[PDB]
Design a protein around this ligand. Structure first.
Ligand SMILES: NC(=O)c1ccc[n+]([C@@H]2O[C@H](COP(=O)([O-])OP(=O)(O)OC[C@H]3O[C@@H](n4cnc5c(N)ncnc54)[C@H](O)[C@@H]3O)[C@@H](O)[C@H]2O)c1
Ligand code: FES
Ligand SMILES: [K+]
Ligand SMILES: [K+]
Ligand SMILES: [K+]
Ligand SMILES: [K+]
Ligand SMILES: [K+]
Ligand SMILES: [K+]
Ligand SMILES: [K+]
Ligand SMILES: [K+]
Ligand SMILES: [K+]
Ligand SMILES: [K+]
Ligand SMILES: [K+]
Ligand SMILES: [K+]
Ligand SMILES: [K+]
Ligand SMILES: [Mg+2]
Ligand SMILES: [Mg+2]
Ligand SMILES: [Mg+2]
Ligand SMILES: [Mg+2]
Ligand SMILES: [Mg+2]
Ligand SMILES: [Mg+2]
Ligand SMILES: [Mg+2]
Ligand SMILES: [Mg+2]
Ligand SMILES: [Mg+2]
Ligand SMILES: [Mg+2]
Ligand SMILES: [Mg+2]
Ligand SMILES: [Mg+2]
Ligand SMILES: [Mg+2]
Ligand SMILES: [Mg+2]
Ligand SMILES: [Mg+2]
Ligand SMILES: [Mg+2]
Ligand SMILES: [Mg+2]
Ligand SMILES: [Mg+2]
Ligand SMILES: [Mg+2]
Ligand SMILES: [Mg+2]
Ligand SMILES: [Mg+2]
Ligand SMILES: [Mg+2]
Ligand SMILES: [Mg+2]
Ligand SMILES: [Mg+2]
Ligand SMILES: [Mg+2]
Ligand SMILES: [Mg+2]
Ligand SMILES: [Mg+2]
Ligand SMILES: [Mg+2]
Ligand SMILES: [Mg+2]
Ligand SMILES: [Mg+2]
Ligand SMILES: [Mg+2]
Ligand SMILES: [Mg+2]
Ligand SMILES: [Mg+2]
Ligand SMILES: [Mg+2]
Ligand SMILES: [Mg+2]
Ligand SMILES: [Mg+2]
Ligand SMILES: [Mg+2]
Ligand SMILES: [Mg+2]
Ligand SMILES: [Mg+2]
Ligand SMILES: [Mg+2]
Ligand SMILES: [Mg+2]
Ligand SMILES: [Mg+2]
Ligand SMILES: [Mg+2]
Ligand SMILES: [Mg+2]
Ligand SMILES: [Mg+2]
Ligand SMILES: [Mg+2]
Ligand SMILES: [Mg+2]
Ligand SMILES: [Mg+2]
Ligand SMILES: [Mg+2]
Ligand SMILES: [Mg+2]
Lengths: 108, 71, 168, 17
RNA sequence: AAUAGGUUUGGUCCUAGCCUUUCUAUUAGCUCUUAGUAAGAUUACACAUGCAAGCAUCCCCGUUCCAGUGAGUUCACCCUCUAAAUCACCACGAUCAAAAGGGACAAGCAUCAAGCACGCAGCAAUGCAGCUCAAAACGCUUAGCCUAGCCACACCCCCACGGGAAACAGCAGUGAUUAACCUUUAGCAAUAAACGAAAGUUUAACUAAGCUAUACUAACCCCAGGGUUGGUCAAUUUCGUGCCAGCCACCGCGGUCACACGAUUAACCCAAGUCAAUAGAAGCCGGCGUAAAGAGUGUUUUAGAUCACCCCCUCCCCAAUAAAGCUAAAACUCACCUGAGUUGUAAAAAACUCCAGUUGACACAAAAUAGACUACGAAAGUGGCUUUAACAUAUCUGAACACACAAUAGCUAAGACCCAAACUGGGAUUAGAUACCCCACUAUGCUUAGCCCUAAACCUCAACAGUUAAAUCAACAAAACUGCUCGCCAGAACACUACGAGCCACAGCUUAAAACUCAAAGGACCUGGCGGUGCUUCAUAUCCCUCUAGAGGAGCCUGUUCUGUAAUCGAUAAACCCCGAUCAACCUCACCACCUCUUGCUCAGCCUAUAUACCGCCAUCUUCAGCAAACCCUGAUGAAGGCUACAAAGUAAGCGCAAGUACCCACGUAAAGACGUUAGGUCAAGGUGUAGCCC
RNA sequence: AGUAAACUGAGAGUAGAGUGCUUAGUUGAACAGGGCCCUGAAGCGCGUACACACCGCCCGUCACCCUCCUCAAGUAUACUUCAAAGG
């Protein structure tokens, strides 16, 4: 662009950054509604344990439960963090193992 | 060059024209309702003017015309 | 690279190289110059090269330019008293124009040196405060004085935790 | 549908040796 | 974004997003020794209890400060003028600083483009009709700020007469709420403030403590944890698991050799921390033929530029445009004569048969040849003839919207109608044929008057000016650039969409997002594969025809398949099928049933799995002639490429062919036949890797 | 081309066992020109969105399915604005 055009338009304006599923927050509290498994998108093959939780913000979302084995049940309290499950489309939240009702994975 | 980008646009426009074709009677009823609200929104904006200026009724001999009708 | 011809003109170093600082009387400087003609070449270079430097050193002086309004180029200064100073610049180089107006309406080097000294009185070395306004923030930074407790702990006798304990 | 790796991503230990 | 790195492809280059590495803060997990220091609700939601303003010979003064919070939000800065206040009193001043006046002063959105009285003159009466605004008015949304600090607020109604109602955004503390979570300590000794003439009195300001790895600094005889270890990126042994469990910031990993999962061992990094999530810090001088981007065309406005004086060489004509008039060829129609068929195509059917052929008359349709020309016009467009009018600008640039245009298609009204022709109807094709093929006919193509305002409106090259020397240059296109200006662009897709607004448009046009989603999308080029891919020349027992004898039908022999059986295996398109077998009544034998043996003919054994781990020996193109180390050169030292004999960048060991040898020759037939192709055949010739069995 | 065709013998392997295989000999032909739909090769091209390489890639209707958004009848709720005024 010309100097006159650069002057007339001004300094570039960044797009307002897009808040993620945590709404720009490190963690959120949630209440487990249901548990189920999701199929990863190809070429991956697995039954990845997920759950639907109602977040403290009111919105419901699907959250991946990491680790081998969990004991989550409907009406239980969990802390959820950000981070997408790469092979699960639409799953952008992760349950924090070792907080509230979700305990640490039992060794071997 | 290839026409793959044109082909994406081609299908989008075909499906849109076909969608509008299928629902042209619903869209006509929706458009009619919007024009009514548009006319009401216009009449309110003019009424706001004379009311905020201290008048109690529209200026003598003023009739707000219908500026959104096909006629 | 930087856009335009002579990109040096759009650098803070270049703009600070102006030597013309107008006296407080100068309020408006109008420049009448011609786009074409060999005798108005210095006035064109003056507008091109030096008007930016003059404005930088004199931000509150209005500078207005006028193209091809008269047969010859000239500068006219309007002073607060109401006096007008006409400077004919036809046939003069841009460097001579800058030297001319510096002589008749620019502050001399002595008047400017004084102002710089009066500014140094505003930042007294003996004062303590934020680094923005003062060289040092606290006397603890002076060698020989009791250092800061954040860096060197104080003797138990100089601490209130233990003065009250003995007294109580 | 046996996973077919990319030939360019194929790992080699020639440098490690 | 940097000293950068990873990631699109079969490959290269380019573009581009995403991500990695760095530094902070908060929260989470796990872990944690001491001392000093600094800093410390998520919430302008609700608050139990205590305290936070007194002083003083009564008056006054103070409680209008300090402390708090960040809801609201251009009252903060400069200048002018001038109060209150300080200087005991006067200050004819200084200091400090309100109100008023002038100026300046956040971000995003223009899909907020018009605001609607926003001005001026006059002593007044009153007169004029102006004022702001794309250089962003008006409006919406967001946010305390420019931090020695300032502004704002003080439960709410902007205010606080009044009303709702009964107030911690003072300190300590509590409830609810949030991922977020400090003591219901002491002292007025210091400093600050209030009061007093003063000794002094008071103060949850403050001072000194309490609590907390949030940080800094120092230390530790004793005591280390957290994460990571496929690549980016420092660092993995042995097991388990077997596309499952799980993992991953990105690319990706996991189906029997998992450095990527889990455990275990070891290692790496940091360390009283570690680093999971989140947030922030680093973002315009780059581009627009083909990647996102020159918006269909021209003009001009406020302005900008130096390409304007100087200083100069393509006026007139050819297919600009508008109007009026005109017609040569070919149609249509009509008439006479003649014929009995005409139309339709790879071939038919349907259709017509007042049909066809010759001759004559004959248009509001369309404009061979010229035109191999490259002209006119702003573009769109413009190619029969004549005439009239007529093709802006003595500096350039200048609009999605202003102004005027703008192919084809389409709309409204009235006409013309030869031919063509969506749609429709009929014929045929087809598994179907709402197509392609044939016939008929309509809207429409034409005229007139209005609209509509789109195009692959494209030299896919913005206007103007200048240069041919530099580096010629990613690639291709069209040799590479400079100055200047306007327009436009900032990953893909959503999306020529939604909503808003405007429009003679109403199933429309113009302008044009977001949410969810992804790690690509994309441009150019190379190679390979493939083509219902072109041309050319070929196959010599050879692709077709030609020549001879066969197979395909019958019986039998034999192999395979299928079925059957308690009852092997292997081969199994060419390149399996009288094949491993130059050979099964027992044996062979590896199969089935029953019985028996257990250091066993063997310093055991296994014809168990895997020919997709192999050696060995082979099929196959091969009824081929090529493979190729080592060098050299071209393409900018890109993926790539390397031949011309009157030769122009190739030289080539070796291997194969060839030669030679065998058979009856030098002929023929054998033999030979590389590299590579088919993860081709064979673990059951034998051997053997790995895994499995051992009464 | 001593080829095809026909006829005859021997051998390998077995205790024996093939209309099989290997091999020796006998008699002994016909045609050999013309073409490129097909088949395959060679050369020189052209296109390419395929690269798991046409048994490729790939578009849309419908079905199922989750995530997000738009439109939308009637109705309800909440919020904003007024006095920045007049007698
Ligand atoms: N909008 C005006 O009336 C106006 C007045 C003076 C100057 N300009 C200049 O026009 C340019 C475009 O301005 P923008 O980006 O704000 O407008 P824009 O292009 O966004 O258009 C918005 C409005 O301005 C008009 N506009 C557009 N281009 C214009 C032009 N060149 N001149 C005049 N009007 C124009 C449009 O018709 C419309 O009404 C700028 O260079 C601006 O300085 C515009
Ligand atoms: S800064 Fe001076 S004593 Fe701490
Ligand atoms: K990159
Ligand atoms: K008092
Ligand atoms: K605030
Ligand atoms: K308030
Ligand atoms: K005190
Ligand atoms: K790793
Ligand atoms: K003609
Ligand atoms: K074109
Ligand atoms: K090819
Ligand atoms: K037969
Ligand atoms: K082999
Ligand atoms: K074997
Ligand atoms: K084996
Ligand atoms: Mg993760
Ligand atoms: Mg689409
Ligand atoms: Mg922590
Ligand atoms: Mg006073
Ligand atoms: Mg003031
Ligand atoms: Mg605009
Ligand atoms: Mg909108
Ligand atoms: Mg706020
Ligand atoms: Mg309160
Ligand atoms: Mg209030
Ligand atoms: Mg409190
Ligand atoms: Mg905290
Ligand atoms: Mg006193
Ligand atoms: Mg403390
Ligand atoms: Mg991936
Ligand atoms: Mg593996
Ligand atoms: Mg293993
Ligand atoms: Mg591991
Ligand atoms: Mg493009
Ligand atoms: Mg253009
Ligand atoms: Mg266009
Ligand atoms: Mg112009
Ligand atoms: Mg334009
Ligand atoms: Mg514009
Ligand atoms: Mg347009
Ligand atoms: Mg048009
Ligand atoms: Mg028309
Ligand atoms: Mg016709
Ligand atoms: Mg039909
Ligand atoms: Mg017609
Ligand atoms: Mg005509
Ligand atoms: Mg065109
Ligand atoms: Mg232009
Ligand atoms: Mg985009
Ligand atoms: Mg369109
Ligand atoms: Mg649209
Ligand atoms: Mg709309
Ligand atoms: Mg038979
Ligand atoms: Mg068998
Ligand atoms: Mg088999
Ligand atoms: Mg096999
Ligand atoms: Mg085969
Ligand atoms: Mg037996
Ligand atoms: Mg037997
Ligand atoms: Mg056995
Ligand atoms: Mg094999
Ligand atoms: Mg020989
Ligand atoms: Mg041979
Ligand atoms: Mg040989
Ligand atoms: Mg195989």
């Amino acid at each position: 662009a010309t100097l006159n055009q650069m002057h007339r338009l001004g300094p570039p304006k960044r797009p307002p950054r897009k808040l993620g599923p945590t709404e720009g927050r490190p963690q959120l509290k949630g209440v487990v509604l249901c548990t189920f498994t999701r199929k990863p998108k190809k070429p991956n093959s697995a039954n990845r344990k997920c759950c639907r939780v109602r977040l403290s913000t009111g919105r419901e979302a699907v959250c991946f439960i990491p680790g081998e084995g969990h004991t989550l049940q409907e009406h239980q309290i969990v802390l959820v963090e950000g981070g997408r499950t790469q092979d699960l489309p639409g799953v952008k939240l992760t349950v924090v193992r070792g907080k509230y009702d979700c305990g640490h994975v039992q060794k071997k | 060059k290839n026409v793959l980008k044109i082909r994406r646009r081609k299908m989008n426009h075909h499906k849109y024209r076909k969608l509008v074709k299928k629902t042209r009677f619903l869209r006509r009823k929706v458009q009619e309702g919007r024009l009514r609200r548009k006319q009401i929104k216009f009449e309110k904006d003019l009424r706001r003017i004379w009311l905020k200026a201290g008048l109690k009724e529209a200026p003598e001999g003023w009739q707000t015309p219908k500026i959104y009708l096909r006629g | 690279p930087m856009k335009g011809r002579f990109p040096i003109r759009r650098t803070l170093q270049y703009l600070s190289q102006g030597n013309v600082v107008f006296k407080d009387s100068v309020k408006v400087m109008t420049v009448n110059y011609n786009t074409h003609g060999e005798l108005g070449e210095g006035a064109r270079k003056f507008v091109f090269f030096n008007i930016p430097q003059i404005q930088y050193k004199n931000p509150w002086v209005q500078i207005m330019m006028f193209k091809n309004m008269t047969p010859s180029p000239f500068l006219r200064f309007y002073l607060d008293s109401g006096e007008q100073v006409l400077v004919d610049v036809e046939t003069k180089s841009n460097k001579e124009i800058m030297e001319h107006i510096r002589k008749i309406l620019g502050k001399n080097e002595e008047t400017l040196r004084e102002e710089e000294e009066e500014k140094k009185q505003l930042s007294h070395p003996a004062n303590f405060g934020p680094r923005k306004y003062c060289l040092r923030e606290c006397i603890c930074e002076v060698e020989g004085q009791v250092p800061c407790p954040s860096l060197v702990p104080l003797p138990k006798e100089m601490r209130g935790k233990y003065k009250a304990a003995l007294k109580a | 549908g046996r996973k077919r790796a990319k030939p360019r991503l194929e790992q080699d230990s020639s440098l490690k040796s």
